[PDB]
Amino acid sequence: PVFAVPEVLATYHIFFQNCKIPLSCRANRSRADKQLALRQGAVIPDIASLDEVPKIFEVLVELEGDNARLAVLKRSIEVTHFAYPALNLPPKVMSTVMSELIPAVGDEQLARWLETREPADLEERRKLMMAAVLVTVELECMQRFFADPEMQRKLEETLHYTFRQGYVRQACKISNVELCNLVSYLGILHENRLGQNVLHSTLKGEARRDYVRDCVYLFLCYTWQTAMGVWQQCLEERNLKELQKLLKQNLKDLWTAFNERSVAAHLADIIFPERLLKTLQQGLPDFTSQSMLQNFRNFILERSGILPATCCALPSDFVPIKYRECPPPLWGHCYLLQLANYLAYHSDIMRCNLCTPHRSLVCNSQLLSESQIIGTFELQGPGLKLTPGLWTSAYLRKFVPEDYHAHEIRFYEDQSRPPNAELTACVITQGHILGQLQAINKARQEFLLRKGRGVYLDPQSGEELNPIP
Amino acid sequence: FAVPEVLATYHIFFQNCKIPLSCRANRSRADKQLALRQGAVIPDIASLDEVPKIFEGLGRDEKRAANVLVELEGDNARLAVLKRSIEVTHFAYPALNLPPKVMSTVMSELIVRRARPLERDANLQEQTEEGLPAVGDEQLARWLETREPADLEERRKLMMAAVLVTVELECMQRFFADPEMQRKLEETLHYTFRQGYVRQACKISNVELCNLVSYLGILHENRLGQNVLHSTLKGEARRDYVRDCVYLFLCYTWQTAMGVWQQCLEERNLKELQKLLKQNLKDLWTAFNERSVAAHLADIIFPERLLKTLQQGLPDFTSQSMLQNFRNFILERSGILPATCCALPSDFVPIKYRECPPPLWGHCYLLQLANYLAYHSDIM
């Protein structure tokens, strides 16, 4: 029973960062899809730092290789300033380390550290710390959050679910029960009929790569933003005093690290406790339906001053590609985009290792043989019937922790190497029983063929009047 | 619950049909017909007998381009790209039918009783009385004073079409034609487009009214809304977009009205309608034309008191945001990806009744009335 207009208020997401569109936006790069292409063996992209990026080197212009979807867009657009999803650490967390810096340290302690009379080193160290606290801390937090192999497994499986490809599709087909419909939020695991997730098949060619690339990007943004919001809403102002004391105690060491990536390595460690990360990772990544992603996509578009009905428009198109092609600010966004592309090509979305090794019926003989006998089960001895629902539950629950290479793109069944673990069926374990069931099924079928019609045999004698060889 | 999601129970029925070949897109010169001037009156009802016949084909005067949906010249580039990309064979129009309960009772009492499945205890017994038409041949001949079977069949089909389409249209005439409702519709359009009077009200109060939203009179005071983007665009595209905005708003209004109706029924009302139908059967069966019977049925099931109680608080305030969300969900369900360049639902609607198939005359009237309010309000 609901008596209210469909829209609701959600303070979790309402935050945006306004900055000028890059000269090197996606739409302004015709061959961007060429570089973005990934092949077998590609390794997960890593964050970058100002140490290896000296200076940023860089509204829409009709390029020579502008593809159809981008060609009409590059034309009908009043592009002045495109807003971006506000991807940031909680405002208080930030307050803690900006008020601590404010230059409070001064130059005397810096000179003590450098052990040299050159002020250039002092200025360089100050700039390193400022850049670290501005961009490299966040990049490190992202790197740790999304790089957990278990967390990457979870992301891969939720993407599998949302785009209905591979093992989830097989389960839906065999089950006769629709499994895509499950939509979740912080583990609540609701169910919605009013949800479309199979409309992405209507697109192909470069129209698909891009579109999916987008959908995955917004999904990652939604994940991170909800994570940050839930963390913020569970802040303790006592933990704030503890953070203040810890920063006071550690600043002496923190101002004495040579690398910038190292500087950020320790700041994240001190500020981002492992227990909190694990608690957030408990059940946070939640199933998202394509419809919700499109609704969020429209939110971003409208709030940013572009009518959703001025033909095609995707937020992922207004963002740079490489780190040295983007202003420091949006470096988190660049990292997110590279991560999204890596996941998209990893998941085969254009199976990853979640389908080919074991869950694939074609590759796994035992699983196929078990499936063939799904319905022809029977045992009364006064149900014991292997129902579709039970086998599908067993198939879905199973996942082999090994043989799932989370470091690079391997795509088993393309390598000429054996599997890490032997393939086994989901419910049935002993192969002898499976052989017996196969034998009884074959005898059943052959008998039915031999006497399906019934046979007429002579009344006086006993020969068959219509024998079939 | 997920924030950017939706699950209601009274705004999603989505009658499905094949796109009429004579739909709005396929008429390139539709813009000229859509033109209206000072000497224009509200669109009028049309009955099945009133129109001689229906023709669905593209017809003459339309020439296929040299390249369901056929590419044509003399049309907005939006239509060109739309036709080049999408050529679906079905669309999920919003449902505007009367509630299933009232329609089922009307049909059972008047046309024919619904035949439930035969439970297996006997067979070959021709107990036609259960499945017999409500009025037999002899009674119809008596009332019609003629043995001509052609007249009996034509009258039967006439009121079958009547109870299937016109009664639905009749209610609508009444419900949207009221001058007071007309004033309220103008006011809500001004509020949602922030034009003139609303702009000066915001200036005087120093508070933008874009955050004013209502639903059955229980205002939610939503703040995430912006209704100033439409001013950027101009031309036939602006007219098309506004004409749509208003058509969808009217569809939502009728849908919520028909939901509040469906909520408030009881078996007492069921028996009341049954008694009224059985006692008046003759005066409905014998009528001069489809307008008379439609009006009589409307009075039977649409008393002025009921209309009155519905109209109050019906035209709830709505945002451009809410509108787009509806449009999005319409196209999503139809099977059409929102990422497609410039797809709107009003394209799949014939302009006027002469070409529409019977079931979609309600949508045709919605679109025509939408155009009339759009032009009269001076959308500029």
PDB file of C-alpha atoms in Angstrom, chain A residues 66-251:
ATOM      1  CA  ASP A  66      33.242  10.561 -35.127  1.00  0.00           C
ATOM      2  CA  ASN A  67      30.983   7.438 -34.971  1.00  0.00           C
ATOM      3  CA  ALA A  68      27.191   7.779 -35.633  1.00  0.00           C
ATOM      4  CA  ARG A  69      26.074   7.994 -31.939  1.00  0.00           C
ATOM      5  CA  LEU A  70      28.675  10.744 -31.331  1.00  0.00           C
ATOM      6  CA  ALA A  71      28.261  12.442 -34.723  1.00  0.00           C
ATOM      7  CA  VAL A  72      24.685  13.735 -34.085  1.00  0.00           C
ATOM      8  CA  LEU A  73      25.572  14.627 -30.439  1.00  0.00           C
ATOM      9  CA  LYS A  74      28.754  16.646 -31.324  1.00  0.00           C
ATOM     10  CA  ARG A  75      26.265  18.791 -33.362  1.00  0.00           C
ATOM     11  CA  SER A  76      23.106  19.453 -31.232  1.00  0.00           C
ATOM     12  CA  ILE A  77      24.699  20.621 -27.968  1.00  0.00           C
ATOM     13  CA  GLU A  78      24.800  23.801 -25.868  1.00  0.00           C
ATOM     14  CA  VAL A  79      27.892  22.578 -24.052  1.00  0.00           C
ATOM     15  CA  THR A  80      29.288  25.168 -21.652  1.00  0.00           C
ATOM     16  CA  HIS A  81      30.081  23.253 -18.444  1.00  0.00           C
ATOM     17  CA  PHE A  82      29.259  19.612 -17.706  1.00  0.00           C
ATOM     18  CA  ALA A  83      28.827  18.672 -14.061  1.00  0.00           C
ATOM     19  CA  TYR A  84      30.434  15.528 -12.679  1.00  0.00           C
ATOM     20  CA  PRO A  85      29.333  13.186  -9.885  1.00  0.00           C
ATOM     21  CA  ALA A  86      30.844  14.471  -6.665  1.00  0.00           C
ATOM     22  CA  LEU A  87      33.229  11.623  -5.854  1.00  0.00           C
ATOM     23  CA  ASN A  88      34.956  12.537  -2.602  1.00  0.00           C
ATOM     24  CA  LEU A  89      35.747  11.365   0.924  1.00  0.00           C
ATOM     25  CA  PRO A  90      33.348  12.572   3.642  1.00  0.00           C
ATOM     26  CA  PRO A  91      33.440  16.306   4.155  1.00  0.00           C
ATOM     27  CA  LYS A  92      34.410  15.882   7.847  1.00  0.00           C
ATOM     28  CA  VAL A  93      37.229  13.377   7.113  1.00  0.00           C
ATOM     29  CA  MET A  94      38.590  16.056   4.803  1.00  0.00           C
ATOM     30  CA  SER A  95      38.055  18.786   7.435  1.00  0.00           C
ATOM     31  CA  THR A  96      40.211  16.755   9.863  1.00  0.00           C
ATOM     32  CA  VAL A  97      43.308  16.772   7.603  1.00  0.00           C
ATOM     33  CA  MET A  98      42.924  20.307   6.086  1.00  0.00           C
ATOM     34  CA  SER A  99      42.628  21.980   9.574  1.00  0.00           C
ATOM     35  CA  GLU A 100      45.559  19.842  10.698  1.00  0.00           C
ATOM     36  CA  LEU A 101      47.633  21.168   7.787  1.00  0.00           C
ATOM     37  CA  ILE A 102      46.317  24.687   8.447  1.00  0.00           C
ATOM     38  CA  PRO A 103      50.943  26.269   6.882  1.00  0.00           C
ATOM     39  CA  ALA A 104      50.756  24.973  10.448  1.00  0.00           C
ATOM     40  CA  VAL A 105      53.900  22.838  10.208  1.00  0.00           C
ATOM     41  CA  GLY A 106      55.961  25.795   8.986  1.00  0.00           C
ATOM     42  CA  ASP A 107      59.391  25.684   7.384  1.00  0.00           C
ATOM     43  CA  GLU A 108      61.547  24.923  10.446  1.00  0.00           C
ATOM     44  CA  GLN A 109      60.477  21.283  10.771  1.00  0.00           C
ATOM     45  CA  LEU A 110      60.706  20.878   6.997  1.00  0.00           C
ATOM     46  CA  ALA A 111      64.286  22.172   7.045  1.00  0.00           C
ATOM     47  CA  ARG A 112      65.036  19.840   9.951  1.00  0.00           C
ATOM     48  CA  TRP A 113      63.839  16.947   7.789  1.00  0.00           C
ATOM     49  CA  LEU A 114      65.567  17.912   4.540  1.00  0.00           C
ATOM     50  CA  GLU A 115      68.883  18.475   6.373  1.00  0.00           C
ATOM     51  CA  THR A 116      69.700  20.941   3.576  1.00  0.00           C
ATOM     52  CA  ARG A 117      69.656  24.719   3.190  1.00  0.00           C
ATOM     53  CA  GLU A 118      67.884  24.695  -0.191  1.00  0.00           C
ATOM     54  CA  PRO A 119      64.300  26.036   0.075  1.00  0.00           C
ATOM     55  CA  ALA A 120      63.484  24.434  -3.289  1.00  0.00           C
ATOM     56  CA  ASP A 121      63.366  21.011  -1.630  1.00  0.00           C
ATOM     57  CA  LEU A 122      61.094  22.483   1.049  1.00  0.00           C
ATOM     58  CA  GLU A 123      58.665  23.821  -1.556  1.00  0.00           C
ATOM     59  CA  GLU A 124      58.774  20.535  -3.474  1.00  0.00           C
ATOM     60  CA  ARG A 125      57.972  18.557  -0.318  1.00  0.00           C
ATOM     61  CA  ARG A 126      55.115  20.914   0.551  1.00  0.00           C
ATOM     62  CA  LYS A 127      53.693  20.549  -2.959  1.00  0.00           C
ATOM     63  CA  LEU A 128      54.051  16.770  -2.717  1.00  0.00           C
ATOM     64  CA  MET A 129      52.066  16.700   0.524  1.00  0.00           C
ATOM     65  CA  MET A 130      49.382  19.021  -0.863  1.00  0.00           C
ATOM     66  CA  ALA A 131      48.960  16.938  -4.017  1.00  0.00           C
ATOM     67  CA  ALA A 132      48.905  13.728  -1.978  1.00  0.00           C
ATOM     68  CA  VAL A 133      46.145  14.971   0.314  1.00  0.00           C
ATOM     69  CA  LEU A 134      44.240  16.350  -2.685  1.00  0.00           C
ATOM     70  CA  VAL A 135      44.267  13.469  -5.202  1.00  0.00           C
ATOM     71  CA  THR A 136      46.649  10.628  -4.254  1.00  0.00           C
ATOM     72  CA  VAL A 137      44.969   9.812  -0.956  1.00  0.00           C
ATOM     73  CA  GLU A 138      41.629   9.275  -2.689  1.00  0.00           C
ATOM     74  CA  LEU A 139      43.258   7.307  -5.486  1.00  0.00           C
ATOM     75  CA  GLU A 140      44.853   5.018  -2.900  1.00  0.00           C
ATOM     76  CA  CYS A 141      41.543   4.511  -1.086  1.00  0.00           C
ATOM     77  CA  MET A 142      39.939   3.547  -4.395  1.00  0.00           C
ATOM     78  CA  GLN A 143      42.843   1.231  -5.201  1.00  0.00           C
ATOM     79  CA  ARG A 144      42.467  -0.633  -1.917  1.00  0.00           C
ATOM     80  CA  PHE A 145      38.665  -0.754  -1.961  1.00  0.00           C
ATOM     81  CA  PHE A 146      38.075  -2.085  -5.461  1.00  0.00           C
ATOM     82  CA  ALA A 147      41.167  -4.288  -5.840  1.00  0.00           C
ATOM     83  CA  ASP A 148      40.208  -6.963  -3.303  1.00  0.00           C
ATOM     84  CA  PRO A 149      39.946 -10.244  -5.267  1.00  0.00           C
ATOM     85  CA  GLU A 150      36.827 -11.171  -3.294  1.00  0.00           C
ATOM     86  CA  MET A 151      35.386  -7.715  -3.947  1.00  0.00           C
ATOM     87  CA  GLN A 152      36.248  -7.987  -7.639  1.00  0.00           C
ATOM     88  CA  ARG A 153      34.514 -11.372  -7.667  1.00  0.00           C
ATOM     89  CA  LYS A 154      31.449  -9.711  -6.155  1.00  0.00           C
ATOM     90  CA  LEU A 155      31.505  -6.918  -8.743  1.00  0.00           C
ATOM     91  CA  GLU A 156      31.886  -9.412 -11.582  1.00  0.00           C
ATOM     92  CA  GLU A 157      28.959 -11.496 -10.373  1.00  0.00           C
ATOM     93  CA  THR A 158      26.681  -8.479  -9.913  1.00  0.00           C
ATOM     94  CA  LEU A 159      27.560  -7.290 -13.415  1.00  0.00           C
ATOM     95  CA  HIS A 160      26.792 -10.795 -14.688  1.00  0.00           C
ATOM     96  CA  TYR A 161      23.423 -10.526 -12.944  1.00  0.00           C
ATOM     97  CA  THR A 162      22.540  -7.047 -14.176  1.00  0.00           C
ATOM     98  CA  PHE A 163      23.388  -7.682 -17.828  1.00  0.00           C
ATOM     99  CA  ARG A 164      21.922 -11.224 -17.883  1.00  0.00           C
ATOM    100  CA  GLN A 165      24.808 -12.936 -19.660  1.00  0.00           C
ATOM    101  CA  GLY A 166      26.372 -16.337 -19.126  1.00  0.00           C
ATOM    102  CA  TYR A 167      25.762 -18.517 -16.101  1.00  0.00           C
ATOM    103  CA  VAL A 168      22.883 -16.396 -14.804  1.00  0.00           C
ATOM    104  CA  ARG A 169      21.214 -16.729 -18.209  1.00  0.00           C
ATOM    105  CA  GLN A 170      21.718 -20.499 -18.151  1.00  0.00           C
ATOM    106  CA  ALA A 171      20.230 -20.673 -14.658  1.00  0.00           C
ATOM    107  CA  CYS A 172      17.210 -18.634 -15.736  1.00  0.00           C
ATOM    108  CA  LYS A 173      16.674 -20.853 -18.784  1.00  0.00           C
ATOM    109  CA  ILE A 174      16.973 -24.162 -16.928  1.00  0.00           C
ATOM    110  CA  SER A 175      15.196 -22.954 -13.789  1.00  0.00           C
ATOM    111  CA  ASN A 176      11.938 -21.967 -15.519  1.00  0.00           C
ATOM    112  CA  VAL A 177      12.022 -19.351 -12.733  1.00  0.00           C
ATOM    113  CA  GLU A 178      13.204 -15.820 -13.509  1.00  0.00           C
ATOM    114  CA  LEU A 179      16.325 -14.955 -11.482  1.00  0.00           C
ATOM    115  CA  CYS A 180      17.313 -11.631 -13.055  1.00  0.00           C
ATOM    116  CA  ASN A 181      14.511  -9.851 -11.185  1.00  0.00           C
ATOM    117  CA  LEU A 182      16.386  -9.731  -7.862  1.00  0.00           C
ATOM    118  CA  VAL A 183      17.366  -6.138  -7.061  1.00  0.00           C
ATOM    119  CA  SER A 184      19.154  -5.355  -3.807  1.00  0.00           C
ATOM    120  CA  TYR A 185      20.193  -2.423  -1.632  1.00  0.00           C
ATOM    121  CA  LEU A 186      22.622  -2.925   1.266  1.00  0.00           C
ATOM    122  CA  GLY A 187      21.691  -6.607   1.298  1.00  0.00           C
ATOM    123  CA  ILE A 188      17.939  -6.038   1.641  1.00  0.00           C
ATOM    124  CA  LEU A 189      17.462  -8.087  -1.556  1.00  0.00           C
ATOM    125  CA  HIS A 190      14.082  -6.851  -2.741  1.00  0.00           C
ATOM    126  CA  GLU A 191      12.376  -8.076  -5.917  1.00  0.00           C
ATOM    127  CA  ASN A 192      10.917  -5.900  -8.679  1.00  0.00           C
ATOM    128  CA  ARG A 193       8.897  -6.967 -11.701  1.00  0.00           C
ATOM    129  CA  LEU A 194       9.090  -3.436 -13.153  1.00  0.00           C
ATOM    130  CA  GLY A 195      12.668  -3.741 -14.341  1.00  0.00           C
ATOM    131  CA  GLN A 196      14.265  -4.129 -17.766  1.00  0.00           C
ATOM    132  CA  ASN A 197      17.677  -5.755 -18.127  1.00  0.00           C
ATOM    133  CA  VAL A 198      17.617  -7.383 -21.592  1.00  0.00           C
ATOM    134  CA  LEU A 199      17.275  -4.266 -23.752  1.00  0.00           C
ATOM    135  CA  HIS A 200      21.042  -3.889 -24.235  1.00  0.00           C
ATOM    136  CA  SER A 201      20.951  -6.681 -26.835  1.00  0.00           C
ATOM    137  CA  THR A 202      19.312  -4.316 -29.341  1.00  0.00           C
ATOM    138  CA  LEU A 203      22.647  -2.485 -29.736  1.00  0.00           C
ATOM    139  CA  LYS A 204      25.793  -3.905 -31.452  1.00  0.00           C
ATOM    140  CA  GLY A 205      29.039  -2.659 -33.139  1.00  0.00           C
ATOM    141  CA  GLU A 206      30.702   0.372 -31.431  1.00  0.00           C
ATOM    142  CA  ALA A 207      27.209   1.439 -30.160  1.00  0.00           C
ATOM    143  CA  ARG A 208      27.388  -1.460 -27.665  1.00  0.00           C
ATOM    144  CA  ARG A 209      30.932  -1.147 -26.436  1.00  0.00           C
ATOM    145  CA  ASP A 210      30.398   2.479 -25.520  1.00  0.00           C
ATOM    146  CA  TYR A 211      26.993   2.038 -24.002  1.00  0.00           C
ATOM    147  CA  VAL A 212      28.048  -0.739 -21.769  1.00  0.00           C
ATOM    148  CA  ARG A 213      31.282   1.100 -20.871  1.00  0.00           C
ATOM    149  CA  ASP A 214      28.950   3.825 -19.672  1.00  0.00           C
ATOM    150  CA  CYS A 215      26.570   1.669 -17.709  1.00  0.00           C
ATOM    151  CA  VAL A 216      29.459   0.046 -15.806  1.00  0.00           C
ATOM    152  CA  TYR A 217      31.017   3.423 -15.069  1.00  0.00           C
ATOM    153  CA  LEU A 218      27.858   4.796 -13.468  1.00  0.00           C
ATOM    154  CA  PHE A 219      27.421   1.558 -11.531  1.00  0.00           C
ATOM    155  CA  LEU A 220      30.896   1.941 -10.056  1.00  0.00           C
ATOM    156  CA  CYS A 221      30.155   5.563  -9.186  1.00  0.00           C
ATOM    157  CA  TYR A 222      26.927   4.523  -7.477  1.00  0.00           C
ATOM    158  CA  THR A 223      28.763   1.850  -5.502  1.00  0.00           C
ATOM    159  CA  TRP A 224      31.448   4.229  -4.276  1.00  0.00           C
ATOM    160  CA  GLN A 225      29.009   7.047  -3.507  1.00  0.00           C
ATOM    161  CA  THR A 226      26.676   4.856  -1.458  1.00  0.00           C
ATOM    162  CA  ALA A 227      29.694   3.418   0.363  1.00  0.00           C
ATOM    163  CA  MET A 228      30.956   6.892   1.243  1.00  0.00           C
ATOM    164  CA  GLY A 229      27.498   8.010   2.331  1.00  0.00           C
ATOM    165  CA  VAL A 230      26.955   5.038   4.626  1.00  0.00           C
ATOM    166  CA  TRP A 231      30.405   5.570   6.129  1.00  0.00           C
ATOM    167  CA  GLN A 232      29.667   9.262   6.696  1.00  0.00           C
ATOM    168  CA  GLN A 233      26.357   8.540   8.412  1.00  0.00           C
ATOM    169  CA  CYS A 234      28.188   6.227  10.867  1.00  0.00           C
ATOM    170  CA  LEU A 235      30.885   8.763  11.904  1.00  0.00           C
ATOM    171  CA  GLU A 236      31.670   9.214  15.645  1.00  0.00           C
ATOM    172  CA  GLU A 237      32.950  12.672  16.718  1.00  0.00           C
ATOM    173  CA  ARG A 238      35.000  10.684  19.363  1.00  0.00           C
ATOM    174  CA  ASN A 239      36.795   8.864  16.490  1.00  0.00           C
ATOM    175  CA  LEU A 240      37.445  12.382  15.177  1.00  0.00           C
ATOM    176  CA  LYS A 241      39.426  13.239  18.313  1.00  0.00           C
ATOM    177  CA  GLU A 242      41.237   9.905  18.003  1.00  0.00           C
ATOM    178  CA  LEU A 243      42.112  10.745  14.394  1.00  0.00           C
ATOM    179  CA  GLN A 244      43.379  14.149  15.518  1.00  0.00           C
ATOM    180  CA  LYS A 245      45.631  12.547  18.128  1.00  0.00           C
ATOM    181  CA  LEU A 246      46.907   9.923  15.689  1.00  0.00           C
ATOM    182  CA  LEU A 247      47.702  12.598  13.105  1.00  0.00           C
ATOM    183  CA  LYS A 248      49.557  14.611  15.739  1.00  0.00           C
ATOM    184  CA  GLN A 249      51.558  11.531  16.718  1.00  0.00           C
ATOM    185  CA  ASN A 250      52.351  10.386  13.163  1.00  0.00           C
ATOM    186  CA  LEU A 251      52.974  13.704  11.375  1.00  0.00           C
TER     187      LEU A 251
END
